[PDB]
PDB file of C-alpha atoms and ligand atoms in Angstrom:
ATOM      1  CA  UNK K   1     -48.621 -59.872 -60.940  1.00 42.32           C
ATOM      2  CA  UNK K   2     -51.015 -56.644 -61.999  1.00 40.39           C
ATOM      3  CA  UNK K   3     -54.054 -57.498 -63.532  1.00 36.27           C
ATOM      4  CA  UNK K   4     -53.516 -53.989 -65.365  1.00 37.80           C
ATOM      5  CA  UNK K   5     -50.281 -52.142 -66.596  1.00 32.96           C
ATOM      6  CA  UNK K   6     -49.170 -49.009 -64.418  1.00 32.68           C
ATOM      7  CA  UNK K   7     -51.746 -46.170 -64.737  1.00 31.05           C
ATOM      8  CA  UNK K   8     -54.203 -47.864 -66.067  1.00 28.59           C
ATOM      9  CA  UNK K   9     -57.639 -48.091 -64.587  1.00 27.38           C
ATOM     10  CA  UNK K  10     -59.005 -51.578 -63.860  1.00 26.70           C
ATOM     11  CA  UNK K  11     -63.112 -52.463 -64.320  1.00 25.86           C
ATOM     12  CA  UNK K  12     -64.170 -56.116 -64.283  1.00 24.83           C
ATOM     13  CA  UNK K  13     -62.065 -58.271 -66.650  1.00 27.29           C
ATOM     14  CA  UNK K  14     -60.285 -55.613 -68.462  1.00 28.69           C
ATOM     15  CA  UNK K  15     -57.731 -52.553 -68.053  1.00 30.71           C
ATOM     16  CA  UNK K  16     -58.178 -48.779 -69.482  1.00 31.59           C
ATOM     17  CA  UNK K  17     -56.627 -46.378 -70.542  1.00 35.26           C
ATOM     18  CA  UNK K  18     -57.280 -42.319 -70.799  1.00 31.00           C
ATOM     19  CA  UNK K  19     -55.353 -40.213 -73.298  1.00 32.06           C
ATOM     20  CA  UNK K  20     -53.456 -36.967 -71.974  1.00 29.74           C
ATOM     21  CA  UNK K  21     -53.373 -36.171 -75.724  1.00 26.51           C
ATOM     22  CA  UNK K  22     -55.054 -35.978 -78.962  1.00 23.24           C
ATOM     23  CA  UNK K  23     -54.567 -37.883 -81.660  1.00 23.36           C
ATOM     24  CA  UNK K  24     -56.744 -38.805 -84.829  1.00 23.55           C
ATOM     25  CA  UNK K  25     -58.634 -42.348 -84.874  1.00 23.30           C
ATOM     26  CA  UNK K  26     -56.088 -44.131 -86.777  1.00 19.58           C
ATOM     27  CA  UNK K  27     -53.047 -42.992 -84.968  1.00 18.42           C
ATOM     28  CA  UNK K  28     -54.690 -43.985 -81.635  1.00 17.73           C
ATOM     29  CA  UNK K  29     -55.507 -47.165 -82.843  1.00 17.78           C
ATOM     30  CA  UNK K  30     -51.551 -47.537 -83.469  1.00 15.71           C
ATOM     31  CA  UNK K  31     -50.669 -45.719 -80.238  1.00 13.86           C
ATOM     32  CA  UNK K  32     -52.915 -48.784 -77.867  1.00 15.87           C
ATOM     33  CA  UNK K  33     -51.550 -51.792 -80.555  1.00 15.08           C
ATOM     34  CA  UNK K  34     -48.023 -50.475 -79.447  1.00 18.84           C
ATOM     35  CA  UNK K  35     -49.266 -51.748 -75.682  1.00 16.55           C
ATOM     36  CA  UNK K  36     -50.890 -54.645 -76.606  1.00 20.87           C
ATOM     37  CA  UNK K  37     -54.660 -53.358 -76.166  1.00 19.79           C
ATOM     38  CA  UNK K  38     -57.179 -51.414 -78.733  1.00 18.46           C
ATOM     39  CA  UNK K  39     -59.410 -48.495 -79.220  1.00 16.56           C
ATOM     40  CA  UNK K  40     -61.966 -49.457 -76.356  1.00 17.96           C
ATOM     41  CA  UNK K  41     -63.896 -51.840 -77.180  1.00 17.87           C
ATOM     42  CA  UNK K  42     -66.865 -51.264 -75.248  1.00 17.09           C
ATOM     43  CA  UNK K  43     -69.138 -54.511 -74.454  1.00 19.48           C
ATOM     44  CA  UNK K  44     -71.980 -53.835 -72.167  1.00 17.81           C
ATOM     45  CA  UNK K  45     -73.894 -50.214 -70.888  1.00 16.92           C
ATOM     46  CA  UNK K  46     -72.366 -51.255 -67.577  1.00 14.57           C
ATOM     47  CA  UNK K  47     -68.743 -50.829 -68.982  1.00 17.62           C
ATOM     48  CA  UNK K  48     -70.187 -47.370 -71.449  1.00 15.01           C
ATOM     49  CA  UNK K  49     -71.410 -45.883 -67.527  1.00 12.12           C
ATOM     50  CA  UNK K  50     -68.227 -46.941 -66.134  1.00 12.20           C
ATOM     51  CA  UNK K  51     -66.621 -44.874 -68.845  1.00 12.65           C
ATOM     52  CA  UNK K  52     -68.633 -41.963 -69.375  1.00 11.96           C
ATOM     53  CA  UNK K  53     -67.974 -41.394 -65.108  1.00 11.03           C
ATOM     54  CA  UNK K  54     -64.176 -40.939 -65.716  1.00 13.34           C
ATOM     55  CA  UNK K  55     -63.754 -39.571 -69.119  1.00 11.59           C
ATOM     56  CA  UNK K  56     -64.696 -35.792 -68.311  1.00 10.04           C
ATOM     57  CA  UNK K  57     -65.830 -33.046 -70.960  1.00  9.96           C
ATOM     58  CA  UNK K  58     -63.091 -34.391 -73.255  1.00  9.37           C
ATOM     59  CA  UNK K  59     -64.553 -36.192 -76.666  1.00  9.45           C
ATOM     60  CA  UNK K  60     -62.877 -39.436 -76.373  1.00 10.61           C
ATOM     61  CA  UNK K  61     -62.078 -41.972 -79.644  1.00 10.45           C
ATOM     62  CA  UNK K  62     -63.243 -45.602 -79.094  1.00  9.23           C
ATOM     63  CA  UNK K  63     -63.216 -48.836 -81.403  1.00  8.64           C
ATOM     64  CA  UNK K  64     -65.920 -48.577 -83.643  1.00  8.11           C
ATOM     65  CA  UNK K  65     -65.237 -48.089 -87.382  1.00  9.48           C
ATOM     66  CA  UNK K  66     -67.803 -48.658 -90.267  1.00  9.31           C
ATOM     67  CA  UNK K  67     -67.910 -47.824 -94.232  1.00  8.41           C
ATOM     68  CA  UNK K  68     -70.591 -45.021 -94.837  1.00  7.86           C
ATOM     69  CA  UNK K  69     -73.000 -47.327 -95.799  1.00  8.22           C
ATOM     70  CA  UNK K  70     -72.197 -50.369 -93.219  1.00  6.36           C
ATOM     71  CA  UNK K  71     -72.794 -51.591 -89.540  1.00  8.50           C
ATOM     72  CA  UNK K  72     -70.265 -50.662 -86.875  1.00 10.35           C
ATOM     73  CA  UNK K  73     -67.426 -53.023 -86.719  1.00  7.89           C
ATOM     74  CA  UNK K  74     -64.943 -53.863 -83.704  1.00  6.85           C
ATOM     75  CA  UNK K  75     -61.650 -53.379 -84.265  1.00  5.75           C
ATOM     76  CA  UNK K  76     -61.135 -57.226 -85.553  1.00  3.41           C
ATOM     77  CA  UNK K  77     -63.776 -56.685 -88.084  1.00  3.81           C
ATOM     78  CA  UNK K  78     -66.507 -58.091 -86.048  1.00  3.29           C
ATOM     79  CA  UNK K  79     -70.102 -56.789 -86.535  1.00  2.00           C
ATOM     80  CA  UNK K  80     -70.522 -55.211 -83.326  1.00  2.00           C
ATOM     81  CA  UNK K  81     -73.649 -56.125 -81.047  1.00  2.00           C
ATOM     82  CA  UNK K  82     -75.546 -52.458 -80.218  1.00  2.00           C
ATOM     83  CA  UNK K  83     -75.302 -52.306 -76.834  1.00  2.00           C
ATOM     84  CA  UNK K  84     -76.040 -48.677 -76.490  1.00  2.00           C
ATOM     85  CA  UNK K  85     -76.642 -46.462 -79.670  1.00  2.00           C
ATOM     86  CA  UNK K  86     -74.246 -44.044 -81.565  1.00  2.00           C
ATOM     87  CA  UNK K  87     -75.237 -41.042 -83.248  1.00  2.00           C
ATOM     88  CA  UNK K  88     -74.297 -39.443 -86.508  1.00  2.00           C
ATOM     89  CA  UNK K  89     -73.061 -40.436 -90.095  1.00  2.00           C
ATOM     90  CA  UNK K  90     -69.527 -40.139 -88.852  1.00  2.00           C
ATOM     91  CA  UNK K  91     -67.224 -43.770 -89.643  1.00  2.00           C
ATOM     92  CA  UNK K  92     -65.322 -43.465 -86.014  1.00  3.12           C
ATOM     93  CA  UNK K  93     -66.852 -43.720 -83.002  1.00  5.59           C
ATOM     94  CA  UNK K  94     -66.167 -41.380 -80.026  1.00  4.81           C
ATOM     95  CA  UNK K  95     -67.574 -40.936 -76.467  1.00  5.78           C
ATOM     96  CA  UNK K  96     -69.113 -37.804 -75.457  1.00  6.67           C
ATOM     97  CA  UNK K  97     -71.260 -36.372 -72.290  1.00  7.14           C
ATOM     98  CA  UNK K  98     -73.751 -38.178 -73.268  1.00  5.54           C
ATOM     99  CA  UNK K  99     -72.949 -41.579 -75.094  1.00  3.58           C
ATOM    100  CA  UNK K 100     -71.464 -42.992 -78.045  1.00  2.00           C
ATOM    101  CA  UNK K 101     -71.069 -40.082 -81.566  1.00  2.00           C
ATOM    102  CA  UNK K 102     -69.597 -40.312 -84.308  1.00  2.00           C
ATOM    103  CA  UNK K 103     -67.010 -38.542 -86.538  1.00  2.00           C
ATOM    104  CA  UNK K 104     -64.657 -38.364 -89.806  1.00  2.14           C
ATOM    105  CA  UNK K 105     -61.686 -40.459 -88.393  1.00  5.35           C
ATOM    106  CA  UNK K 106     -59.229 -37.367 -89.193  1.00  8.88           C
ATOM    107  CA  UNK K 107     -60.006 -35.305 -86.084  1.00  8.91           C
ATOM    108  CA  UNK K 108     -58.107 -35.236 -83.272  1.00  9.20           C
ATOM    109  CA  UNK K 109     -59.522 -36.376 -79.925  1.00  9.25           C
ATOM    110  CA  UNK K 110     -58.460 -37.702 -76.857  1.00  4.73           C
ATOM    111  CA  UNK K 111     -58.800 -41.851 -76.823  1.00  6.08           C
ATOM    112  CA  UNK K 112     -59.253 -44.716 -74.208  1.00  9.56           C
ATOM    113  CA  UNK K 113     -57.449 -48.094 -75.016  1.00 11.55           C
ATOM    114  CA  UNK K 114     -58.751 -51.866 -73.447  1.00 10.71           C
ATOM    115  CA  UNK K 115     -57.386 -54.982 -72.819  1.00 13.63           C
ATOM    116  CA  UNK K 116     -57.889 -57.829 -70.981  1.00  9.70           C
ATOM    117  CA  UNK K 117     -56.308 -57.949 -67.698  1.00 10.89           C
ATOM    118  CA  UNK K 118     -53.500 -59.995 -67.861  1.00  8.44           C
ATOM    119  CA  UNK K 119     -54.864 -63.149 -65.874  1.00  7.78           C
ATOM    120  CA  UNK K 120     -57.814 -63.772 -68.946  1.00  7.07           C
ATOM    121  CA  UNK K 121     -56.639 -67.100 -70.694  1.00  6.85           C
TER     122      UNK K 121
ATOM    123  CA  UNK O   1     -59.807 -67.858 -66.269  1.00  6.60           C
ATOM    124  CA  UNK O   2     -58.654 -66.196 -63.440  1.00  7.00           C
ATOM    125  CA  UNK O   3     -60.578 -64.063 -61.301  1.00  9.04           C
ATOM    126  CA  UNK O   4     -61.435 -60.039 -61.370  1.00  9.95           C
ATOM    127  CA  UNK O   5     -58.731 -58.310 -59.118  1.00  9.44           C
ATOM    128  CA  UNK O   6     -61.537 -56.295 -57.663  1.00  7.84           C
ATOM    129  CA  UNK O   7     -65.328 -56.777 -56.294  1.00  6.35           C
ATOM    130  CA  UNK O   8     -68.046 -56.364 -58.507  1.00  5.35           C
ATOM    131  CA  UNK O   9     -68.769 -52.076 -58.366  1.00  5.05           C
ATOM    132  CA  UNK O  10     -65.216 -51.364 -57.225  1.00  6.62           C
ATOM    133  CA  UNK O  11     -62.175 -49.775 -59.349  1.00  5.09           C
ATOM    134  CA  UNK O  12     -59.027 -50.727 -59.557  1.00  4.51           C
ATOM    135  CA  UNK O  13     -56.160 -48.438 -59.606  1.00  2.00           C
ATOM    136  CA  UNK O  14     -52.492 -49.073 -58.816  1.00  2.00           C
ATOM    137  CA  UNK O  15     -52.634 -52.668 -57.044  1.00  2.00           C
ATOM    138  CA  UNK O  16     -56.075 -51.208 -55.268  1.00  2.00           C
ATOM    139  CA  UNK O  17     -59.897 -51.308 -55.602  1.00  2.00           C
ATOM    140  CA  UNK O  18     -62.137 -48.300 -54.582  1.00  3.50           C
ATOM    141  CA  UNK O  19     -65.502 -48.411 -54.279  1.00  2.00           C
ATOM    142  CA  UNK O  20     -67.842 -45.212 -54.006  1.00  2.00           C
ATOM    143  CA  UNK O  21     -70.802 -44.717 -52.023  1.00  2.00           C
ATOM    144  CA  UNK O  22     -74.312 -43.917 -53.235  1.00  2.00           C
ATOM    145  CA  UNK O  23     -75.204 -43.403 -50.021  1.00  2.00           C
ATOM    146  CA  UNK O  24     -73.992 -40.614 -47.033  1.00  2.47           C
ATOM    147  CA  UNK O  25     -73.111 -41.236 -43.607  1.00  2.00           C
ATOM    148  CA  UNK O  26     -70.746 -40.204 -41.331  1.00  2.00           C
ATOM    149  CA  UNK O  27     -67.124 -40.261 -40.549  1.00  2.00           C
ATOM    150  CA  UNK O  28     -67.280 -43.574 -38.020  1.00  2.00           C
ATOM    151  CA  UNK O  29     -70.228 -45.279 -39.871  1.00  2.00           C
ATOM    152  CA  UNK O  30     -68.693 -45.180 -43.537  1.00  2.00           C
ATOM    153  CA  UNK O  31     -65.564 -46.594 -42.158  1.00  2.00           C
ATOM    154  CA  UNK O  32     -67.712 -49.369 -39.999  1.00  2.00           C
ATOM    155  CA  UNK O  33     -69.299 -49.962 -43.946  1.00  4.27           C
ATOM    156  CA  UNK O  34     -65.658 -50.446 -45.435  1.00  5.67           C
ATOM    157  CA  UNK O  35     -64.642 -52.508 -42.613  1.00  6.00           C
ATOM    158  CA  UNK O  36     -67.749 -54.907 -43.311  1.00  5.17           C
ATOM    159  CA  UNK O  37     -66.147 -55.344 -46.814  1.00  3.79           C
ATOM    160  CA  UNK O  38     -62.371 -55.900 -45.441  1.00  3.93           C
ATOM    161  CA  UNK O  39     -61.429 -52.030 -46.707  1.00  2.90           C
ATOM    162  CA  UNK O  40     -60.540 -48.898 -45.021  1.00  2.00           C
ATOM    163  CA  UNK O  41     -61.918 -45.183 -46.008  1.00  2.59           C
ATOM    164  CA  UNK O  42     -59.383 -44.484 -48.789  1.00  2.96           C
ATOM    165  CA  UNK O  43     -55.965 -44.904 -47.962  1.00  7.11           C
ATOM    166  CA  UNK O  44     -54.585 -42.156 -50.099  1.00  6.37           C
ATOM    167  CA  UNK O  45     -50.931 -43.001 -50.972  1.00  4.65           C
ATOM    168  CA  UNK O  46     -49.828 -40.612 -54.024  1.00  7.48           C
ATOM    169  CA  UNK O  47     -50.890 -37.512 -56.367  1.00  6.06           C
ATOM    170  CA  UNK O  48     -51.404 -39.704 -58.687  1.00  5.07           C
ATOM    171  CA  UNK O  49     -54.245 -41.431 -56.547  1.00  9.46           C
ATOM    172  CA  UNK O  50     -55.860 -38.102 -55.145  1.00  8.25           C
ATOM    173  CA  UNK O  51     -56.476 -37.118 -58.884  1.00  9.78           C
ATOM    174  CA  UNK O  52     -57.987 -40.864 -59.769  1.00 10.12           C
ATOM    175  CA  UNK O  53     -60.518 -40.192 -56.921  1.00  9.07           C
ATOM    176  CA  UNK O  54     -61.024 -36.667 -57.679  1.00 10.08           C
ATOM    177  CA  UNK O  55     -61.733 -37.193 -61.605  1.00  7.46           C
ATOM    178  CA  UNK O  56     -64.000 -40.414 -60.809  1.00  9.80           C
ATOM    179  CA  UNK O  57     -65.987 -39.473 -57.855  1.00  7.79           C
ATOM    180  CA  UNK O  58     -68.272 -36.626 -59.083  1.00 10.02           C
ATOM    181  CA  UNK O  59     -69.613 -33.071 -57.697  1.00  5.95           C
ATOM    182  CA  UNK O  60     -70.408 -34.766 -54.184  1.00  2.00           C
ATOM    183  CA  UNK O  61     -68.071 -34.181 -51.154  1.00  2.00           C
ATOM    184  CA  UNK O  62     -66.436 -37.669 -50.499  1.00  2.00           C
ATOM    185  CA  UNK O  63     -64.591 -38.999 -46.983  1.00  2.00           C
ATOM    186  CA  UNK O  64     -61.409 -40.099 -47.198  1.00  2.71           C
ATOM    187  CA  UNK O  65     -59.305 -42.336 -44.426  1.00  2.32           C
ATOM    188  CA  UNK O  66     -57.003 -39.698 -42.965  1.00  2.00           C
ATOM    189  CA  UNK O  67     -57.821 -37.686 -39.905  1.00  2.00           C
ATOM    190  CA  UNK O  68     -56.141 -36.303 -37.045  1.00  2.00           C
ATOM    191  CA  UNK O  69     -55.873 -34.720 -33.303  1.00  2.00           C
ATOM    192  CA  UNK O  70     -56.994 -30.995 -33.207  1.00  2.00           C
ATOM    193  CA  UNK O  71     -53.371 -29.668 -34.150  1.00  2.00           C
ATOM    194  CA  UNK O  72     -51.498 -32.479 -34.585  1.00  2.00           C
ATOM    195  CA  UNK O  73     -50.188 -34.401 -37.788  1.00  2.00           C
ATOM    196  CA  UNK O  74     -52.710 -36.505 -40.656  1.00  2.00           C
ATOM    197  CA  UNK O  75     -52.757 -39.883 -39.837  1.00  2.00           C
ATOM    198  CA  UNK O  76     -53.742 -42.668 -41.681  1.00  2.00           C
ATOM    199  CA  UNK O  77     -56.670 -45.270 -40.043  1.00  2.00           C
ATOM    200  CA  UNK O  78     -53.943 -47.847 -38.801  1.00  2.00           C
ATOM    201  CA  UNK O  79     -52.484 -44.965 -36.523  1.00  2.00           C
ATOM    202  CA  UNK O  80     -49.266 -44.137 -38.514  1.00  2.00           C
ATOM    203  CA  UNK O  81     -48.782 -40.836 -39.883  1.00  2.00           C
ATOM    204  CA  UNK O  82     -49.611 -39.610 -43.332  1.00  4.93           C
ATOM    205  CA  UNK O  83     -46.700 -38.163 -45.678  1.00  2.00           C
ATOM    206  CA  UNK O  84     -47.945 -35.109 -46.757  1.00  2.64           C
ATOM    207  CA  UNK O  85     -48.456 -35.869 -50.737  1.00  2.10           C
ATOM    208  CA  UNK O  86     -50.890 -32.822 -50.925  1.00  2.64           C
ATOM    209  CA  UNK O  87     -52.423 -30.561 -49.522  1.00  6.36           C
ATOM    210  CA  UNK O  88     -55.494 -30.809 -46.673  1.00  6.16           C
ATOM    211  CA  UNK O  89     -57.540 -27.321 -47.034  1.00  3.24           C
ATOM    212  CA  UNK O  90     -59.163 -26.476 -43.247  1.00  3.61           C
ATOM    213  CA  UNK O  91     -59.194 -26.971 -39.448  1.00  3.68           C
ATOM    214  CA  UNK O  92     -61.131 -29.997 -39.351  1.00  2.00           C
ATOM    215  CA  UNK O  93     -60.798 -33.407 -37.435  1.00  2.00           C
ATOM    216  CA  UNK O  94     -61.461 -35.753 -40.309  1.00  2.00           C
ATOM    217  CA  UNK O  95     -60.317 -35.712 -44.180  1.00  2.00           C
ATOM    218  CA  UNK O  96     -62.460 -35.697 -47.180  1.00  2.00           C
ATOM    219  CA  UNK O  97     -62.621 -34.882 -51.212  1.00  2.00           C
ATOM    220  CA  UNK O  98     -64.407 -31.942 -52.407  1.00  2.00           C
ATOM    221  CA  UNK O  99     -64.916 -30.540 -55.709  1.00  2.00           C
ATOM    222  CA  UNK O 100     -60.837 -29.198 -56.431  1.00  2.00           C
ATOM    223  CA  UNK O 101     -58.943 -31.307 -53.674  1.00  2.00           C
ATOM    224  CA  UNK O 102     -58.810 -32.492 -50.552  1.00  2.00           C
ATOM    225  CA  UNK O 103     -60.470 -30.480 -46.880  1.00  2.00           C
ATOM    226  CA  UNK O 104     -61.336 -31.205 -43.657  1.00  2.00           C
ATOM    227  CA  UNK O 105     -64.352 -30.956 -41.581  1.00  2.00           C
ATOM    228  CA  UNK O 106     -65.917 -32.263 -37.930  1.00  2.47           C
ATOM    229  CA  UNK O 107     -66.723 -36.266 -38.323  1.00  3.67           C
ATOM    230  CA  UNK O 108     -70.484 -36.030 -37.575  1.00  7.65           C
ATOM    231  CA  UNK O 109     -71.235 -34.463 -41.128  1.00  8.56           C
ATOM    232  CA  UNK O 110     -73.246 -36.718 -43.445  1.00 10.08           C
ATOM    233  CA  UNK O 111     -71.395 -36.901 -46.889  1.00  7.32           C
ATOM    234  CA  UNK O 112     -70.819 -39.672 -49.580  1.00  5.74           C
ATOM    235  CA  UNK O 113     -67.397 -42.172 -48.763  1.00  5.00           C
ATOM    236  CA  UNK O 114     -64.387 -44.080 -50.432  1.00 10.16           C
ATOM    237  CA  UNK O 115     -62.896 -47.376 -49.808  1.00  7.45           C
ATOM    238  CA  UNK O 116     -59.773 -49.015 -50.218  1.00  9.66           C
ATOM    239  CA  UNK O 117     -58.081 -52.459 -50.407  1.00  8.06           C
ATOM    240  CA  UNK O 118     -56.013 -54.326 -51.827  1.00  5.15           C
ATOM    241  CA  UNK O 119     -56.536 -56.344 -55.202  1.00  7.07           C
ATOM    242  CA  UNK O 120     -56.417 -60.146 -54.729  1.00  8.66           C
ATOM    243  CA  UNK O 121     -53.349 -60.390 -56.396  1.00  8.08           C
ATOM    244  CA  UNK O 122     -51.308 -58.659 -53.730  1.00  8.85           C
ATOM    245  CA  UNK O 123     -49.160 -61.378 -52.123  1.00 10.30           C
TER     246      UNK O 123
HETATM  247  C1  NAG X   1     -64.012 -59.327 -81.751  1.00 11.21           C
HETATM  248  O1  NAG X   1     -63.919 -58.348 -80.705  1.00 11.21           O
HETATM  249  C2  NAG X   1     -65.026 -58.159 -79.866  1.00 11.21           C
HETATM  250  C3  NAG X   1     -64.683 -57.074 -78.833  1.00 11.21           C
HETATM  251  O2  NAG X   1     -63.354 -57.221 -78.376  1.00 11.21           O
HETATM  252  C4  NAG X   1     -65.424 -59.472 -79.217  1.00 11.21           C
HETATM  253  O3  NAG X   1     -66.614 -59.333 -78.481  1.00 11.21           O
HETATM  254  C5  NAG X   1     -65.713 -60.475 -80.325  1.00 11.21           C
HETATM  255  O4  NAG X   1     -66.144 -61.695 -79.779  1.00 11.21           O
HETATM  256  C6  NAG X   1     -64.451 -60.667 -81.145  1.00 11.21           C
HETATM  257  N1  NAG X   1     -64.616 -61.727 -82.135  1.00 11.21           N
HETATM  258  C7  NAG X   1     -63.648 -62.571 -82.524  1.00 11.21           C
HETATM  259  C8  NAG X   1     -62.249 -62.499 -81.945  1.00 11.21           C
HETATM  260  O5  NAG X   1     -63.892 -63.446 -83.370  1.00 11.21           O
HETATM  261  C1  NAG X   2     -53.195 -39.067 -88.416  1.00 12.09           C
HETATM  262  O1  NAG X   2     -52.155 -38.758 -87.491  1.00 12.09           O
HETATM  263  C2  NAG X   2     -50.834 -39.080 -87.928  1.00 12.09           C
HETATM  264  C3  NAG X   2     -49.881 -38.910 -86.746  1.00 12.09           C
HETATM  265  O2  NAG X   2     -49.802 -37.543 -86.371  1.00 12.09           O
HETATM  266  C4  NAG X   2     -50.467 -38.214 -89.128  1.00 12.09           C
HETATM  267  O3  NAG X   2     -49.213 -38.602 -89.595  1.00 12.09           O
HETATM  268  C5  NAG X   2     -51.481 -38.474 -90.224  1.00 12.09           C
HETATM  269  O4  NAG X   2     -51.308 -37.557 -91.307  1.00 12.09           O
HETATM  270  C6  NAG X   2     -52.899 -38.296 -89.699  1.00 12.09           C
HETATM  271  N1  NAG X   2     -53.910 -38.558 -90.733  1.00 12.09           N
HETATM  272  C7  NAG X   2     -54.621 -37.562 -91.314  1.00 12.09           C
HETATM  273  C8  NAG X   2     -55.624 -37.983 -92.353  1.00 12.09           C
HETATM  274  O5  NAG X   2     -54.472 -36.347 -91.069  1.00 12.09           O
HETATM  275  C1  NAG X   3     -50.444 -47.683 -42.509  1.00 13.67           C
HETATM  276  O1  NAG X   3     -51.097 -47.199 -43.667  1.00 13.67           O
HETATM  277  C2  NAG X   3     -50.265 -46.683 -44.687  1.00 13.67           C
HETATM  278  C3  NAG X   3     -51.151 -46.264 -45.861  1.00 13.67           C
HETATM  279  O2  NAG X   3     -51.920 -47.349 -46.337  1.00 13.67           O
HETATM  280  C4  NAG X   3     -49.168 -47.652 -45.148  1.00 13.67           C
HETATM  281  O3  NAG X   3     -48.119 -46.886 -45.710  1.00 13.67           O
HETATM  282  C5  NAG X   3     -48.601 -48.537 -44.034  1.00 13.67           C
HETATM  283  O4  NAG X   3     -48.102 -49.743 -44.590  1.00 13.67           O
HETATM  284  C6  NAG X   3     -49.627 -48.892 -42.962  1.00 13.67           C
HETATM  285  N1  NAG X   3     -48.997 -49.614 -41.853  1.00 13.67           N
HETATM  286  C7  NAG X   3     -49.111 -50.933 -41.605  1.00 13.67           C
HETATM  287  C8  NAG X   3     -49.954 -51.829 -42.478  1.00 13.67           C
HETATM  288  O5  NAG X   3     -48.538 -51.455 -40.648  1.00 13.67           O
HETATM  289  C1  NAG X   4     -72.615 -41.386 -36.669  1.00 11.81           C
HETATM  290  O1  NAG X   4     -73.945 -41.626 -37.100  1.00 11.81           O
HETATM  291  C2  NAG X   4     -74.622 -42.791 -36.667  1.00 11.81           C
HETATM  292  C3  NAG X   4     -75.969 -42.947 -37.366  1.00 11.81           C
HETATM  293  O2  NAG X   4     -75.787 -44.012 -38.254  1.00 11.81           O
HETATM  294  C4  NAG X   4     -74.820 -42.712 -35.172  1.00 11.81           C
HETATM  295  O3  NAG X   4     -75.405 -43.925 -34.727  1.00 11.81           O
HETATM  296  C5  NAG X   4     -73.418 -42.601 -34.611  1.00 11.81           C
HETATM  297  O4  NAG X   4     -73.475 -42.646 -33.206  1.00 11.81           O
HETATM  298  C6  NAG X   4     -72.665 -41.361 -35.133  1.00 11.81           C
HETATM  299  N1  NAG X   4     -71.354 -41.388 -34.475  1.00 11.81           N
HETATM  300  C7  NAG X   4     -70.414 -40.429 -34.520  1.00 11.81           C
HETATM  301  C8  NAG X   4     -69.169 -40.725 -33.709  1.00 11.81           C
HETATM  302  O5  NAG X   4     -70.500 -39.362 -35.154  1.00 11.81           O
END
């Protein structure tokens, strides 16, 4: 049995997934719940490098959301740890080139979806 | 629970983990390096897998696991010839990945290298 579904790209415990299309942040969110997985949630700078070597020039959505005024939160509404900093005033996270931006959650942007590989308890 | 299907530093990709050199050497000594890690120089098996390697690997010139007799048909390291999935660009002896797709070139150049295996839950 896969640790991964078919196409997706396995790193340490979990599976990814790079978008073809673009969607807004919302929509992708919907698009990797459909498959069981989220807007990456990205957990160390080894997994960010990992990331940022695939991904090419595309901006690509990830799953950090925040109100204007608030910390970052993971998709389940954990405070997330700052592992690697994110620019902007934006409330959606994106990768680009260089790291972690940020954006209004309307534009439309290539994604990446995790999960943990099926064999995780 | 469980264990990673891959090694620590390699990639998995369709029931297979890659790993990518830092490093250059060539043709013989990268695949004596995947052999010490129970791997061949990439075994590439589909489109699909040529354009994994190609988007991961980066501006360097990478060896792959195919090569040949002067002439003759692509073969993969275990002897048995290749399928023809893509294209090989040039009139070289031994197989690698450049910037666009796949070439060839004699096996004493020095250049960066790919292995392949299978993930641990294969059987
Ligand atoms: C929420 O999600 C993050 C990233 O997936 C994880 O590190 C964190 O521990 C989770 N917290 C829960 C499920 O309480
Ligand atoms: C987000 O995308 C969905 C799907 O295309 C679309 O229905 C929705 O209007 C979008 N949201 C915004 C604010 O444009
Ligand atoms: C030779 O290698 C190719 C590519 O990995 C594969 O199709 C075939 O199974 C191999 N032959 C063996 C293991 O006998
Ligand atoms: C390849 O290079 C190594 C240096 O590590 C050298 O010892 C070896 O003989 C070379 N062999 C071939 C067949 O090119």
């Amino acid at each position: 049995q896969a640790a991964c579904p078919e196409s997706w790209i396995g790193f340490q415990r979990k599976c990814f997934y790079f978008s073809d299309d673009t969607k807004n942040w919302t929509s992708s969110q919907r698009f990797c719940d459909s498959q069981d997985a989220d807007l990456a949630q990205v957990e160390s700078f080894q997994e960010l490098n990992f990331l940022l070597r695939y991904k090419g020039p595309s901006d690509h959505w990830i799953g950090l959301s925040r109100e204007q005024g608030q910390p970052w939160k993971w998709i389940n509404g954990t405070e997330w740890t700052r592992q690697f900093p994110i620019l902007g005033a934006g409330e959606c996270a994106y990768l680009n080139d260089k790291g972690a931006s940020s954006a209004r959650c309307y534009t439309e942007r290539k994604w990446i979806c995790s999960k943990s590989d099926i064999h995780v308890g």
